Amino acid sequence: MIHLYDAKSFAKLRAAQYAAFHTDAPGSWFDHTSGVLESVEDGTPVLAIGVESGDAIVFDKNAQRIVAYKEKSVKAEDGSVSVVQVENGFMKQGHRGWLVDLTGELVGCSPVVAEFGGHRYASGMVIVTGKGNSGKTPLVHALGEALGGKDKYATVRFGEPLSGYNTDFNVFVDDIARAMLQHRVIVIDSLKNVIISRGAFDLLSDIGAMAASRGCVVIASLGPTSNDDKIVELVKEASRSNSTSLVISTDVDGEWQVLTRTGEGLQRLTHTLQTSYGEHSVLTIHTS
Amino acid sequence: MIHLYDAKSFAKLRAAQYAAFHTDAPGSWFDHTSGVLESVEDGTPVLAIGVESGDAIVFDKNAQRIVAYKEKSVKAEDGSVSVVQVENGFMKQGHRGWLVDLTGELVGCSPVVAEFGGHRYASGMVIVTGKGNSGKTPLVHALGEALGGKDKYATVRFGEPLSGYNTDFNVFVDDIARAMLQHRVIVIDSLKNVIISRGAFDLLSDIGAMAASRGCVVIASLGPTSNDDKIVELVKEASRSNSTSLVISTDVDGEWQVLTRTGEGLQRLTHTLQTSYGEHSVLTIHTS
Amino acid sequence: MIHLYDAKSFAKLRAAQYAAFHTDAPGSWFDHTSGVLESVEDGTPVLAIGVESGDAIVFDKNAQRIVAYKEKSVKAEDGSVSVVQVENGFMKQGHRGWLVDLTGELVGCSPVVAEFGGHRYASGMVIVTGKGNSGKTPLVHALGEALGGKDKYATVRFGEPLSGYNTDFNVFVDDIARAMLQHRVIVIDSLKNVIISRGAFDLLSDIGAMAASRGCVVIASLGPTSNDDKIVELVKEASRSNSTSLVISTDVDGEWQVLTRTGEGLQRLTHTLQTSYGEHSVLTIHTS
Numbered sequence: 041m042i043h044l045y046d047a048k049s050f051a052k053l054r055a056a057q058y059a060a061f062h063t064d065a066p067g068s069w070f071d072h073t074s075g076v077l078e079s080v081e082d083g084t085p086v087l088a089i090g091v092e093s094g095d096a097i098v099f100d101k102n103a104q105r106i107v108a109y110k111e112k113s114v115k116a117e118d119g120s121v122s123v124v125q126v127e128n129g130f131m132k133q134g135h136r137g138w139l140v141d142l143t144g145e146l147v148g149c150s151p152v153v154a155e156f157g158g159h160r161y162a163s164g165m166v167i168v169t170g171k172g173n174s175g176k177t178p179l180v181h182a183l184g185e186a187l188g189g190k191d192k193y194a195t196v197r198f199g200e201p202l203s204g205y206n207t208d209f210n211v212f213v214d215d216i217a218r219a220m221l222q223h224r225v226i227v228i229d230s231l232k233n234v235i236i237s238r239g240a241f242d243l244l245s246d247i248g249a250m251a252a253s254r255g256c257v258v259i260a261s262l263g264p265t266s267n268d269d270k271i272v273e274l275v276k277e278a279s280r281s282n283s284t285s286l287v288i289s290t291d292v293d294g295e296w297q298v299l300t301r302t303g304e305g306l307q308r309l310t311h312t313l314q315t316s317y318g319e320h321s322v323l324t325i326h327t328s
Numbered sequence: 329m330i331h332l333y334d335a336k337s338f339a340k341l342r343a344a345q346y347a348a349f350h351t352d353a354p355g356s357w358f359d360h361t362s363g364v365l366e367s368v369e370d371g372t373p374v375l376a377i378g379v380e381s382g383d384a385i386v387f388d389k390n391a392q393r394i395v396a397y398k399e400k401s402v403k404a405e406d407g408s409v410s411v412v413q414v415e416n417g418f419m420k421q422g423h424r425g426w427l428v429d430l431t432g433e434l435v436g437c438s439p440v441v442a443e444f445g446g447h448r449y450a451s452g453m454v455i456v457t458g459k460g461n462s463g464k465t466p467l468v469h470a471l472g473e474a475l476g477g478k479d480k481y482a483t484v485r486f487g488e489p490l491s492g493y494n495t496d497f498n499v500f501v502d503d504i505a506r507a508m509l510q511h512r513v514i515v516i517d518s519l520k521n522v523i524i525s526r527g528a529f530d531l532l533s534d535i536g537a538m539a540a541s542r543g544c545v546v547i548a549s550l551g552p553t554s555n556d557d558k559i560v561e562l563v564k565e566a567s568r569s570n571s572t573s574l575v576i577s578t579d580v581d582g583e584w585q586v587l588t589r590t591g592e593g594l595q596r597l598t599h600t601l602q603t604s605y606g607e608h609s610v611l612t613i614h615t616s
Numbered sequence: 617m618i619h620l621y622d623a624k625s626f627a628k629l630r631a632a633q634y635a636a637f638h639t640d641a642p643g644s645w646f647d648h649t650s651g652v653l654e655s656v657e658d659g660t661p662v663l664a665i666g667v668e669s670g671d672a673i674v675f676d677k678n679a680q681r682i683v684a685y686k687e688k689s690v691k692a693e694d695g696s697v698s699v700v701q702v703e704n705g706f707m708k709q710g711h712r713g714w715l716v717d718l719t720g721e722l723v724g725c726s727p728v729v730a731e732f733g734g735h736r737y738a739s740g741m742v743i744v745t746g747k748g749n750s751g752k753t754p755l756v757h758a759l760g761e762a763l764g765g766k767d768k769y770a771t772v773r774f775g776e777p778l779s780g781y782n783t784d785f786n787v788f789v790d791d792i793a794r795a796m797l798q799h800r801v802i803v804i805d806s807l808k809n810v811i812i813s814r815g816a817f818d819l820l821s822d823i824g825a826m827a828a829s830r831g832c833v834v835i836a837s838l839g840p841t842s843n844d845d846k847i848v849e850l851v852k853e854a855s856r857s858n859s860t861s862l863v864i865s866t867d868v869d870g871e872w873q874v875l876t877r878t879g880e881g882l883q884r885l886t887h888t889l890q891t892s893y894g895e896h897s898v899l900t901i902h903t904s
């Protein structure tokens with residue numbers, strides 16, 4: 041919805057946004073929103089996401105699709121009305137994104153997802169990009185478990201010429217919906233083939249916001265499918281624009297830079313990662 | 329589906345993926361998946377592939393088309409539900425790719441298809457590419473024979489101005505689907521007219537993963553029509569990204585370089601091939 | 617169809633392909649496929665070709681258009697199934713190209729269509745290109761006459777601002793279909809207005825293979841319509857690609873080079889032609 045501010049209320053917002061990344065307990069936003077999703081009375085649409093055609097499919101809290109949902113509306117604080125209707129497995133009325141309130145006045149945050157190696161990491165969308173054979177796949181997985189911490193991370197696989205990878209975009213949005221409904225730390229390998237369809241355009245535009253709203257982190261390998269030229273900036277500015285955080289390889293072996301948006305209008309942070317390979321191409325991020 | 333990992337189960341996956349290439353018996357994954365396909369219940373749709381329009385046609389285990397199929401849903405381990413329905417010869421519900429699970433938890437592999445001249449070769453898609461008219465046709469044939477070994481290889485012909493060559497994309501994808509259903513080693517000559525329709529974009533995106541999942545190898549001649557300029561990266565990298573392996577001509581006559589993706593996040597291997605022509609342009613790949 | 621090979625059967629294939637060009641009596645493949653066409657039942661579709669919209673029109677063995685044809689299916693040796701149906705003048709089911717099997721196991725040939733001046737010429741598509749008033753029109757007619765030998769050659773006219781030229785693409789494909797069904801040596805003047813519609817894109821992909829399968833030669837004048845700055849590189853390379861043979865002008869007046877693909881995987885031959893004009897711009901190819 042829209043929000044109104046004066047100097048005082050705006051100072052409060054910013055303080056609250058600063059706190060959401062800097063001082064709230066890591067993973068707390070996800071547990072909260074998990075609570076909100078659990079208390080949703082079953083059958084209620086919770087999430088809508090674009091398929092390849094530009095239409096949207098709709099999910100309930102248990103990540104099952106909704107085929108049929110008759111018009112229901114809700115009135116917000118700002119006087120606006122949200123409506124949801126699902127017909128023949130497609131959204132007839134509504135919008136893309138979360139269809140129940142996970143934030144609730146607190147908007148423009150990058151909720152802290154995890155802490156590792158003396159650094160806090162934001163929820164939202166993390167794009168891992170860089171020079172060909174940068175070691176992107178090993179890096180998303182290392183980031184996956186590191187930020188998972190005590191929890192397992194979910195791996196969504198897409199569009200690579202390896203065994204068991206889905207290459208159908210609609211199954212892909214279904215995997216991603218399920219991941220974000222059920223898990224705090226999610227890896228996508230990869231976005232190569234998404235980079236276009238309306239679904240693909242919707243996805244890039246929608247996912248960071250959906251993830252941030254949830255307080256989960258989606259760690260997505262990108263990669264320009266052509267050129268080791270200065271195309272390492274087009275997708276890396278499509279990266280810069282649609283990502284909460286950016287992880288880029290450097291000229292130094294095994295070294296990466298992490299750039300994080302810490303919230304709305306707040307300062308962007310930078311830190312470095314050192315990494316090395318063990319057996320079977322398992323990568324470790326160095327910490328202590 | 330999506331898969332959940334912690335450090336320990338990930339290390340087991342990488343061990344398992346490494347083995348699928350490096351220590352499994354060659355052609356063993358193909359025999360296994362032949363066994364899975366054999367054991368499906370009669371009439372079960374097994375494979376869907378995009379036709380020119382972007383719709384999908386569906387095949388059973390004996391590479392015969394299915395034209396009508398009442399909606400059947402199956403619930404995967406990750407809570408995902410897969411649905412398949414076919415009407416008037418066209419998929420009405422489902423996805424492109426394999427419609428039964430060939431892989432399970434074991435995904436992200438490049439299962440060894442064959443061993444020849446002291447080197448292991450991956451299943452999936454191998455694109456053969458190079459300068460102008462570089463001897464691609466003779467090489468895809470020698471490589472088919474060689475990887476076939478005890479078995480005959482299947483030849484799918486498409487889009488060249490020579491006798492008996494199909495030029496209809498929809499007959500092409502029917503040929504490809506049957507080839508992958510029934511044979512471990514498949515040669516495609518050529519992909520030049522594919523490089524786009526919706527079906528053509530789908531084929532390029534799907535075929536490597538379909539082949540890798542089956543344990544079969546598709547050896548495809550490419551070719552840009554025009555330019556020896558830096559279109560020798562435009563069709564390429566469109567190759568190094570859609571392909572499990574690349575075979576590229578060098579500046580030395582008869583010499584080729586093989587670049588192999590051995591698995592998800594695993595090391596890319598390189599080796600060289602020396603070749604010579606015998607009678608009637610039959611190419612031999614040197615070994616010992 | 618798809619075809620299976622081992623070393624020995626591939627060796628046989630290449631020998632048969634080599635003989636189809638080098639040792640068969642010239643024009644014998646044309647006479648062979650004529651016999652196959654004469655054997656098909658009355659009313660049966662033999663050939664489908666793309667019209668402007670990308671729909672296909674269908675012809676019978678006597679080059680008459682089929683408007684209605686009840687669904688009939690046919691199962692080839694490889695297990696593949698062809699379904700042909702015509703309805704309201706347009707292919708409801710089937711594929712572009714030959715609808716009956718003209719070639720069998722003998723595929724990937726460039727069947728000798730004629731001999732003239734001590735050179736064998738291939739059936740298929742011969743694109744005549746170069747320069748800009750190199751004398752393309754006189755050359756296609758001289759080549760038509762010479763390859764015709766004892767037979768008259770057929771002239772298909774299209775898209776030139778001269779008396780009696782068809783400029784309608786659907787009449788063009790009707791002319792080309794009839795020509796290939798009835799004559800071994802066909803001249804097309806010219807392809808400038810086809811170089812895009814779906815039909816126009818279908819033609820360039822289809823006709824080399826259609827002609828080679830029949831054992832007829834289509835001698836097509838191409839011509840760039842605009843530019844002369846490395847556009848002669850583009851069309852000479854986009855020609856090299858959809859053509860069985862290329863005839864190219866040189867920097868020497870009246871002189872042309874002929875580049876011939878002699879079959880699948882086989883050696884490409886080159887020879888030169890010297891020519892001169894007599895009365896009324898009638899061109900003679902010098903021989904002996």
Ligand SMILES: Nc1ncnc2c1ncn2[C@@H]1O[C@H](COP(=O)(O)CP(=O)(O)OP(=O)(O)O)[C@@H](O)[C@H]1O
Pocket residue numbers: 172173174175176177178230261262263317318320321589592593594595596
């Ligand atoms: N033991 C090891 N030592 C050094 N590098 C290794 C390694 N194991 C894997 N790698 C590197 O890690 C990469 C990970 O696999 P891939 O997914 O194939 C490439 P990527 O960097 O993710 O980019 P791309 O797939 O987007 O092109 C390999 O290409 C390889 O360069």
Ligand SMILES: Nc1ncnc2c1ncn2[C@@H]1O[C@H](COP(=O)(O)CP(=O)(O)OP(=O)(O)O)[C@@H](O)[C@H]1O
Pocket residue numbers: 460461462463464465466549550551605606608609877880881882883884
């Ligand atoms: N005995 C021999 N010695 C040397 N070269 C030979 C040969 N027999 C065949 N070739 C070459 O091998 C090629 C046969 O395959 P072709 O289909 O004609 C070209 P290609 O490299 O596959 O790419 P293209 O078809 O995309 O142009 C020809 O270029 C031919 O010159």
Ligand SMILES: Nc1ncnc2c1ncn2[C@@H]1O[C@H](COP(=O)(O)CP(=O)(O)OP(=O)(O)O)[C@@H](O)[C@H]1O
Pocket residue numbers: 748749750751752753754806837838839840893896897
């Ligand atoms: N007596 C003569 N002496 C020399 N050249 C002659 C000639 N009579 C005709 N020509 C050549 O043949 C051409 C006639 O064919 P046109 O169709 O007019 C051009 P083209 O070379 O076929 O290419 P275009 O039609 O694709 O532009 C003339 O432009 C000229 O180059």
Ligand SMILES: [Mn+2]
Pocket residue numbers: 176177230261
């Ligand atoms: Mn990768």
Ligand SMILES: [Mn+2]
Pocket residue numbers: 464465518549
């Ligand atoms: Mn070739």
Ligand SMILES: [Mn+2]
Pocket residue numbers: 752753806837
């Ligand atoms: Mn002309």
